[model samples]
Target: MYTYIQNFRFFAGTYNVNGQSPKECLRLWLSNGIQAPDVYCVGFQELDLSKEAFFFHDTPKEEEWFKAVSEGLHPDAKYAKVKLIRLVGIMLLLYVKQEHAAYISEVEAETVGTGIMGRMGNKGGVAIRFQFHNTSICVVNSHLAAHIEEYERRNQDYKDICSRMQFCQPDPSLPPLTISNHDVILWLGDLNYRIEELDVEKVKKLIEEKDFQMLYAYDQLKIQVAAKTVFEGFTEGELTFQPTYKYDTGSDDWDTSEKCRAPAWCDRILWKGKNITQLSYQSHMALKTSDHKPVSSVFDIGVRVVAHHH
Candidate 1:
């Protein structure tokens, strides 16, 4: 057997909409320019957080976002929806160009609950795993524990999902699949990790000065990445944009209420893959229906090509 490589463009977006309806076009959140990607993975957290939401399979919100995504793409970019998985407030949708649809196969989805008693769908993850040609790609969209003080619980949730979220193999005779089993994995969602040990005023000062390094030093995710608690092998592009969380709904300003939740990079997209090059990472603030801004990242990924000789 011989192997070759092919490059593919991928776009990933994560947003915590706070159970709000789509009020604006999502093009800015979907595509960065006229050149569309070969694959698009969009993740949503807190799509519906009400009591009724936990008991029902609410799909109106997913349909609204699907419409937004369809309208958001470039006119010439013909794509087809591959899969959509929802776990209460968590949702993950995967799309691919129509031309490449035939090459994709073995699509599957799985959900893991990490909410109340570690069994509530309200706080958990929804994942879609499939084969793009010979490449095994998995995308997980999760809504973890919230609040600054709940960072430990959030970390635990990460571990639990990584361990429990499993996509079945096409052949039951084959080994079971976990996130690490994939050749490429993309994790996107509201991890809810806050900026630790920083006052709201100081965090605001750093953002104003465009001092991302200083701000990142206090980012809970970055700290965990270094410690290998979660996101062990995943790589995130440079965060040139401002934090995506804690904004006042429909306003550019950060939280101004008595709680004054210190702004943090709550929404994120992280990937682990061989020969993966990130092209861009940014946050879209124009859609202000929610307190958290939508974040997106573009990546140039390499897939393996196998050949056999008889």
Candidate 2:
């Protein structure tokens, strides 16, 4: 009954790539500098959304995204891949330093699609869960219903994903794993939560004024999360960065389409667990491959791996 905790630097990132391939190295989106994290979890939505990509499981685009992530990892140490999971347009990749291979085990993946009459792969969640020493860790990448007025629909989508996402287990005696089954959980990706009531012009004005408080007050996810309708019991870092959705692709401007949607902090990362310290949370604006900017967070998470007889 004697044990201690070990702090591991875990990095998790999510991006709605909008079906675009890698334009260059993903170092800026994947790594901050030469100091690499002990664990990396990269998740993506719309990796290749064409009709063809939607039907296929191991599409060619999966390698392209994985390669970009591979080249970007800090070169100070060697890392090993745990798995790359793709659910139609959704994908999640897990990697751990080779040094920790001995301690990580029972890795499993699961996907839940909430599209096409509630059974399609167009939109949904893909997740990976594994035991890191004595700690059970899970990371989920999900794409929910879009549009400002469909917050209710998105809530149902989130609910379905949370319940349907179950990992496979070898022992039939034990029940399959759910999001709450993990010791530490990181839920990420483009949840597609938008801003309610705020028009495009007002959103642009507050963003320009750097008034995040007023803007966040109208965020749909904030309202629903406050109501425990979505992301129930999850912890999100202080969003000091700008809203990261509905941008003019290839430019920094907000949406310019006829719809002119109000900007939203759709791309987000949230966690549910104890002994987790969020070191940094921010969006990457340099990459313009998609209308949605990438969001990443770094955490010093306590892993229950130091169990020993003292």
Candidate 3:
């Protein structure tokens, strides 16, 4: 007898799909309307940054982006696909809702390679931890270290993928799981954090007057979370949309040519729990193939529902 707390509905997405695989119809990167979310954490970056995708091991482009996120959440067939994880070009996917998939369990997937010589998988991070129904949930999905003076190499690749991503214990007799020992943590991808000190024509003229809090006050992850040096106990919302990176793939136009990549918001979606609750932190921009643009968040989390008795 015991335990109770419930507020489900979570969806998180981050995309960099730059290695192009899915050729359209991901329901604009998996639903946002006609409601659907009881859990789904999708993430991808480059997906196959070639060079034989860093000496292959997991490919088929993660089953073509997990069959386009299972036919774009298959018109809400009460979701399914429990897990998927990849490292090269980073990928992470997890879904649930088949009646909470039997209250999930210790499901796990871990990876940490911080690019070239630092154990390269072209750049890394692909995590997925589980436990929902007793809450734990830890989703990472990263692909750091990319141009624009590499922002201290993407803040040392998020402190080397959060102190070398542990998560081990597929039954080596337990004892190893860290994402700060989760209770809900989500980091999402392509954190190329740019738009430093504004001036790409004043950030396209305050993104043509949409102002966006004066372009999120020159955000570079709000100056690395205001100098706490990297998402210290993350939490992001208040971006007021627009600026999801260079664009110009299928076209909603932005980067007009020759490295004019000033528009930056480089795809993100951050969170760290305590009963989470974001409800929506935008970006999908009509899914143009990918010069980066595809970010989403919506939470309500808080789970815990035990009653087990035999």
Candidate 4:
């Protein structure tokens, strides 16, 4: 309301629920376990994988997630849900503080289906685009093709999503939409990109030794992004946390019962565009409802409030 008018704290979270129900306390990720941001973009993958979930609505699931987010809000702050979009198992929710609510406009949403026959939602993305003050923002939540072996398929899925996702405008003269049309694009979701060139034993042991630097070298997503294969120019804060995927449900143990799944940072938060400073990027190990741990990132993003005169 006074100074620092061009900077806003933005928070983003991405988690794969593994089709589990929501837990009572999601603050550890949603609220950063302490401070609150000016705007929140929380998303989920595999929220519901049932066959009916592909066609029917699961209002209850969205409400439960939203209610948990609302409960996670700082007691001293006032926030309202800006919008929510869901495409099958993928869902995203946006919230903004009361102090900056009126400055948002031109809200639009779009969903892409790339799972089956290019017409299913099982593997796709849902996005929301809007103008925040003078900065345009877009947030996407998606569940790409899964499996440690489907890395190329996952890449194809993401490229498909990026090329097909569109934001609409009411004006007939407005040009067609693309996710890149926005000023700041936040893609937070379960990308399912697995680690490479390492086996389960080596990866797990490295995690035990807290050798994230060595492990980041084998991250397939980083490998691809570095090669300019996909998600080029996007900034994912330093990899200071362990992999968030392939854990035993309701336990800290890795997937050892059968598949002996190798861990990977399947869940992630990434941003594209300049002037976005990521302060903290980490995962919540205490959450056990889902096999994959939840991840969140805090950002100081530059925005604009127009002045009437010079």
Q: How high is the CA lDDT of each candidate model?
A: 0.87, 0.88, 0.83, 0.85
On TM-score, the candidate that comes out on top is 2
Q: Tens digit of lDDT per residue, candidate 3, span 174-282? A: 7788787888898889888877776789998899899988788877878888898888978888888888888778888887998787888887888887877887888
Cα error, residue 4 of model 3, in Å, equals: 11
Off by over 4 Å in 1: 306-310
- Number of colliding residue pairs in each model: 0, 0, 0, 0
For model 4, residues 63-165, the per-residue Cα lDDT tens digits are 7777877887766689988898888778888889998889889988889988888668988899989999878899988788888788888888889999998
Query: What residue pairs clash in candidate 4, if any at all?
Result: none
TM-score of each: 0.95, 0.96, 0.33, 0.95
Best by lDDT: 2
Error of 3 at 67 (Å): 17
The deviation in Å at residue 255 for candidate 3 is: 1.6
Q: What does the lDDT come to for candidate 3?
A: 0.83
Model 2 C-alpha lDDT per residue in residues 36-136, reported as the tens digit of each score: 89999999999998888777656778989899999988788688999889988899999999999789889999899998899788989999999998899
> How many backbone collisions does model 1 have?
0
Quality of model 1 by C-alpha lDDT = 0.87
Candidates 1 and 2 compared by TM-score, better number: 2
Off by over 4 Å in 4: 1-5, 308-310
Give me the displacement of residue 295 in model 2, in angstroms.
Answer: 0.6
